[PDB]
Design a protein around this ligand. Sequence first.
Ligand SMILES: CC(C)(COP(=O)(O)OP(=O)(O)OC[C@H]1O[C@@H](n2cnc3c(N)ncnc32)[C@H](O)[C@@H]1OP(=O)(O)O)[C@@H](O)C(=O)NCCC(=O)NCCS
Ligand SMILES: Nc1ncnc2c1ncn2[C@@H]1O[C@H](COP(=O)(O)OP(=O)(O)OP(=O)(O)O)[C@@H](O)[C@H]1O
Ligand SMILES: C/C1=C/C(=O)O[C@@H]2C[C@@H](CC[C@H](C)/C=C\CC1)O[C@@](O)([C@@H]1CSC(=O)N1)C2
Ligand SMILES: [Ca+2]
Lengths: 370, 138, 186
Amino acid sequence: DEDETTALVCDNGSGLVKAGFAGDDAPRAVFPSIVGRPRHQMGQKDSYVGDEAQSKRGILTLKYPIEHGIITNWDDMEKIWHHTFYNELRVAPEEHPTLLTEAPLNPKANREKMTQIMFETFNVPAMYVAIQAVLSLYASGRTTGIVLDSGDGVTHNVPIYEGYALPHAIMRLDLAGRDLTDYLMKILTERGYSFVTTAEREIVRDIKEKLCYVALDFENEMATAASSSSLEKSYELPDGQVITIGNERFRCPETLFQPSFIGMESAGIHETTYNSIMKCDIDIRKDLYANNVMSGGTTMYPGIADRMQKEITALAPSTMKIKIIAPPERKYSVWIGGSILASLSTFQQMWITKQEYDEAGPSIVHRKCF
Amino acid sequence: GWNAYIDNLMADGTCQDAAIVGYKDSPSVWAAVPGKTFVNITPAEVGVLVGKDRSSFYVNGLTLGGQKCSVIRDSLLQDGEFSMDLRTKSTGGAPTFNVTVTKTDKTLVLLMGKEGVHGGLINKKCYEMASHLRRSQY
Amino acid sequence: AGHMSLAELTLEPVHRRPELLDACADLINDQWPRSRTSRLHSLGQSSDAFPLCLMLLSPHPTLEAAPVVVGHARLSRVLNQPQSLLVETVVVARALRGRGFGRRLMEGLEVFARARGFRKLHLTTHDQVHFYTHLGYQLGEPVQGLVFTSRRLPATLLPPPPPLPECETQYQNVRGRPIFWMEKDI
Ligand SMILES: CC(C)(COP(=O)(O)OP(=O)(O)OC[C@H]1O[C@@H](n2cnc3c(N)ncnc32)[C@H](O)[C@@H]1OP(=O)(O)O)[C@@H](O)C(=O)NCCC(=O)NCCS
Ligand SMILES: Nc1ncnc2c1ncn2[C@@H]1O[C@H](COP(=O)(O)OP(=O)(O)OP(=O)(O)O)[C@@H](O)[C@H]1O
Ligand SMILES: C/C1=C/C(=O)O[C@@H]2C[C@@H](CC[C@H](C)/C=C\CC1)O[C@@](O)([C@@H]1CSC(=O)N1)C2
Ligand SMILES: [Ca+2]
């Protein structure tokens, strides 16, 4: 008889969607999680989705249906999912089991509504919802450890035992890549430049990604930048004008460790890592300290692993073995982890089937997915 | 008897242990898989499961028939959920297993999966047996 | 009898003849319609590690040099059974059926598998049960096929009881249809 279709893996982020086929080593499609509408001034469409909104962003106001990792606009999120299946992957959703990802601590009613929409609107034959941080841990070759997942809209510390996230110990910080971009715009403006428009924000995001780094010793780096120009870099704007950047290169991601830089009275990611571990079972803390896994685009800064190692060491018992793992593909480690999980022989049992959904309703997601 | 419930929970081969335990007045194992873990559950372990302190077992864990477990999710006293998910702890690389506890009006229903059996399957199984017993005043 | 086969045929994996993958997708989707994206991706998974997609090929339509994709079968390894293969998606081009090519596909599969040390083949069917028994299969138990995983992925990984409720999902296909599990020693 005909072989069964390969499962789809869809990782919905605040900023980027990553979608593809289970068992593949990379997503087939990566596109912005946006729906655009005419700024002012038929037109052609009442709304534009994903890469089409990106192409036409000059005439559009852009909305992000996911905020801080949480779905908050369900009508536009449905547009994103429709765009994922039919325009980016060009598959028929009723033909594929579909693995979705969710934020740590995703509210109960949100995961139910996700389940309902998948089964009733897109008519998938089966689905599963996995916590993003857990998938990143799988992609690093482990099932126990603590993940730091920092993306575009939210940052989480997630301790995980044998593949199970421990919700009582999860830490959430509403500071991530978009805030760092906004901060770089601000302090570049304080240097004499003017980055203030939405279009100019996209340029500064590229500056951030290409030139920023985490200093090992922040105050020493500031002194180095004040006493010579060895840390200064140039960047060529699209119109050919050139700007130069100095201590802004490392001041920007220093925010992750000092959220006061953007006016937040919040512990930095090193402190939240420590606090998370200290809420976990005493018997697993050593394994957490030894398996700190970085994931998400905002952990890509050069130097971030060395800095975490240094800061965690200063907080932990003096005899504790500490290891920071920063995989090279960690922009996509959530998606890769989903590809692994949905490919495991042990995963066959885990799907929620359409029949299970008809019997129990959306709340079945709370029994089967954790 | 209650052992019919144990045979029923064990029938599909997904679980290695199962038990029905009374938790009101003086707790005791009403039925359990002989020779395994849940049969040896003590009153003090039952008291921790259903007790007022819902925080210490996160850092200290808890035991079931003396088997150390780590708490993953706790909803055991919460309306409409009445379930707790755990994973055993081991030494020397030995495998660990998923456990779900559900709370009915007069019992706790416990299940332990075999190696590799996902905690979601065990939770669903335990939740359905508990719904069945609640349906009948238990 | 009455299905003697005269054409010259070879049996070759899709991943070694990628130029025929589109024609193979045409063949399968003509029988089992699903999105072409999905069918092309499924065939693109084929590799020496299994799963792999074997094509029965004929050199020409005896006119010019474009080879004909006569048939196809997918082979997958089996959970916990090193010497077993799962056979799926067995199909001969609709216009070429009844010429012995289905027999030659299934027999070629046995040769291919046996050469690599496999000693048992498994598959499911309902309507075609007698095709497989005619070729020496008999009823067996279910098995679980191992799906494609890319090389690059890690690879590390005391009151009385009330009455009970009402006092083999392995044997159904995707749509709740009972199916026969077949097997053959090779
Ligand atoms: C099933 C299929 C591959 C058989 O190939 P075919 O070209 O039709 O059959 P052949 O011409 O090679 O016949 C081979 C032998 O099997 C017999 N045979 C073919 N189809 C048969 C059938 N449905 N039932 C019983 N016997 C059959 C033939 O009589 C012949 O016997 P012989 O060699 O002793 O003379 C082909 O019909 C097909 O692709 N069908 C649609 C796809 C399908 O149903 N696939 C999965 C089956 S679960
Ligand atoms: N080399 C890089 N250096 C610094 N930041 C980067 C780099 N590459 C990507 N980023 C930033 O990562 C963010 C996107 O990462 P990611 O895809 O993990 O987030 P998301 O899933 O869309 O959002 P979230 O997880 O917060 O819901 C963007 O802010 C991007 O600017
Ligand atoms: C290349 C790329 C990066 C990205 O991070 O994309 C995501 C999604 C994107 C949506 C709007 C953008 C114009 C469309 C596509 C950009 C996609 O917004 C981001 O750029 C936001 C806006 S400011 C910022 O730092 N991140 C992040
Ligand atoms: Ca994310």
